[PDB]
Amino acid sequence: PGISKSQLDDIADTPALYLWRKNAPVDTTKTKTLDLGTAFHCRVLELEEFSNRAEEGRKIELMYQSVMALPLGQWLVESAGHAESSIYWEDPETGILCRCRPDKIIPEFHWIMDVKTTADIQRFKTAYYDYRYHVQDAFYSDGYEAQFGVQPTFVFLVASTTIECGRYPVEIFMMGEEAKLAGQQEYHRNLRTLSDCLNTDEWPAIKTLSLPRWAKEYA
Template sequence: MLTAEEGRKIELMYQSVMALPLGQWLVESAGYAESSVYWEDPETGILCRCRPDKIIPEFHWIMDVKTTADIQRFRTAYYDYRYHVQDAFYSDGYRAQFGEIPTFVFLVASTTAECGRYPVEIFMMGEDAKLAGQREYR
């Protein structure tokens, strides 16, 4: 059961996401939420699974939602939390299953309000981070 205060916080966080045009597009686009993707790794033959927060198949986008107390720290801490590994693994799985290279993004919402809003940013990792992630999960 949510308290009234928790409900207000969630509503403000949602409004903050929707105030960002790309955030609104990610939330409102047709797609599959929490759907598992299975594939056999071509190098190892191991059955793999990932479960993205949302897949937008029409445009080959994968979104994962994260919250953080410090959105500035998220920019430099994704290696610490191995988010680059998640990006690479999910992207490789999508490609194996659907034959397309997806655009993988993290929709990150701060849990700390600033000026009456919760900061929201969309993060897309560079190719170097993806390659490092592939090396780590192999």
């Protein structure tokens, strides 16, 4: 297949951990049903397919009814567009094949939405960064434009699985220019580093450590 964002996340850590992923055995024993977001993700998107695949099945129906509340979100879930459609493109600079498959893509006005669920909508507002959700904006937006004509509107639709004051809050987030850019420079920086490993068949694994700030080694 191609290089997804989930991949550039591995090279980001350490080039080696990239091919590690594609080997380390998993413990096939999904015991928690915690992927309620995976469920929500399907409810919101594939509405029929949803009925397929506890006393929690009520939350999912309540949450979904919550995003239908705020207009901008209701518009997103509705409108006219495609869902899991994949997108492929060669990165101009590295010539590498990239792949990203936007949760929902509204053709008419070039809008890309991405469903995500959390426990703290407030925490999100700063957490996203460590999930590299800005690199996920830059990366889909770049692959999108570079295949459909122009940079789309990337909008994160976040929903909470932790009722607050009687309801389940929802929030539509968009990446700020300063960050959208940082993300674009990150994946390219990632792509280049991935390109070396290929041609020069070497994938460093050693993560070098450096004294922390509180290090008494300098007050």
